[PDB]
């Protein structure tokens, strides 16, 4: 105890093992020793200060990626009463992105602590020489506390050289500790803006390399009045839903959406309608991809095929059917626009009510009810998207339009003939109820509990 | 629902689940035999590959998928609302088309769309739905109190709120019975913090998009 | 305004992917790495995730909420790769033998071994409980999945000069399974930062270790 020297008690190389020390016995973390390198790479240095070649033993954080924080404190014990201060020579290896602070406190037998030393940040890549004196005379329960923070917070230390007296002039200070946790503070949120005359070739923000994350750019493709916008792509390689491109066609406060493409592979082109195509970039912070190109080419009616005039009905997909599929019972146009609903109501209070307004091919008109039965009643109910025929009765002939004679036949389709030969025509006031909506159809019981 | 009771098998035939690559991703309301209606905030960015999506119709229990009441269907077309936004988050609805037609069986029935000029008054108790499909009663609230409780975001008329004032029990449709018939008063869109007080929950008002939904049912 | 869509109901987990039967969570008091279930008695993981005691949690979806379909099987023996270069993280792949055979069901099954090397642009499924933010520490308790096409070898070597080996190729996340077209082609090994510029993820090719895995299983079954 008394005969044991204080230097050998404090100063320790811990090459083969720890010297006579008190490291951790009560806290929830225990320091570990790293032989040059270990698992979880980028753990400070790859060697110690003495050996320095792939085989040096140095103390560091107990583990690598920690789930939560752990308080690690190197304890000590009082020493003999020394008049002169105590020179403490050491070299730390503080480095990392989530590094925390470490303090050196002094305790006594009167429940009094002091905290004056504290450092945090990345101090170079090698061992940074440091020195600090001690103004403790007799009673001093000093300690070296730290914290096991999240990933990228490993701190190393080696070759404690606490001596007595005052050492020589310390001329090896820390050159510059750069704050890594705020590496660059990305808050640009800018770049290219609303474009102009066709300078089609342009980078998005950093196109000739993988793009960085957290970037929120915007490209408002505009043109002259009456000109649409085209968005042909020569190369498209993005990430999943986390990285999408919400192509907008607002032109005002009420923004509209046209298409949202993502992922790798050449996606289809976009054909806007107005003269302002707003292109916003939405990227996540995980696994940023390469990017894509965009060469807009303005014009007139791009994408949408030119409709054929001179009695050529153009269905919503671009196909032309002059008179072969003008609501006659065929499915030429695959979008269903050729066989669209050429029937509706008239003077109807609710949705499933009104007149018997019918269009044979071009002009809308009424009908007649001389041979009206329940069969054609439910037929026109189903054709109008309704349920079964609840009731039907005429009121009075309103107009003298080209009404059609409805007929029935076992072939399924109804026979129609727009003959204008009918006195006191009875206009059908169709009263059809709704179909099987969201009502309880199963055999449910009554268990109010 | 956390504070919800188990619903009877067959009481909600218009409640199905959407599977994205074999995984239940979002809810949908079966409107027609070939077109469904779901929220756009959950199916966004996935409309490029409709073949990966698949809808299990008549699904009540995930472990009881071997029952013949569950009719699988494949998606081939996804239509997102044009007025959808990710920053403003307005009009988050999207329809999905089915590959083949399905028959209205005992456990597969279409839902009713809210007709125009029909506003649901506040304070109307009606439960919702969407392993075990539980349900819980959810009353209707006003837009003024809903905006005053959450002043961080502007809730316009295009959406309607419905939920408990004190919280605790909060893609699913907002089914509210009207004249012995259930309607589609909204879809379960989002929630700031579940099981927290003063969290009614804003739902997309379907009554403002009746003509938009009916235009694709044919 | 659906700005935070997390008020879902029965089913529909809170913003996380599911239906990944080969995804297992290695637990030693806290989630640290993932795994890959290839059979009923072996789990594939990263070599740097080696620990003394690891509880292989099978069928885990929420690491903090018990759903009733989890399988907790302790690790019987862990055999790392003999040529595992700890300095360069080469051969970053190890095998974890389960103490008991897992119950194969609809939620826990096996993954097929790779029979062909992954070509450039092949779509792959990656799962894990890793960080979702490039800055800070935001590790939620939810399982997220991410798809990514396989990048070319030239760009992969250019992004990491002198760091990409023949067994590596670019495409909590440590040890995550990278299954491409129903075949486990890659294993998450390391990466410079969290989604840094021109820094894609580094993955170990299991196609070069198929024979080693087969020989290790046959000699330890």
Author numbering:
A (entry chain A): 336 to 784
B (entry chain B): 785 to 914, 926 to 965, 972 to 1019
C (entry chain C): 16 to 186, 198 to 247
What do the authors say?
Human enteropeptidase (hEP), also known as enterokinase, is an essential enzyme in food digestion and is localized at the brush border of the duodenal and jejunal mucosa. Activated hEP can stimulate the conversion of trypsinogen to trypsin via cleavage of a specific trypsinogen activation peptide, namely Asp-Asp-Asp-Asp-Lys (DDDDK), which is highly conserved in vertebrates. However, the mechanism of hEP activation remains to be established. hEP contains a multi-domain heavy chain and a catalytic light chain, linked by a disulfide bond. The functions of these domains and motifs may be involved in protein anchoring, macromolecular substrate recognition and inhibitor specificity. The light chain is homologous to trypsin-like serine proteinases with a typical Asp-His-Ser (D-H-S) catalytic triad responsible for peptidase activity.
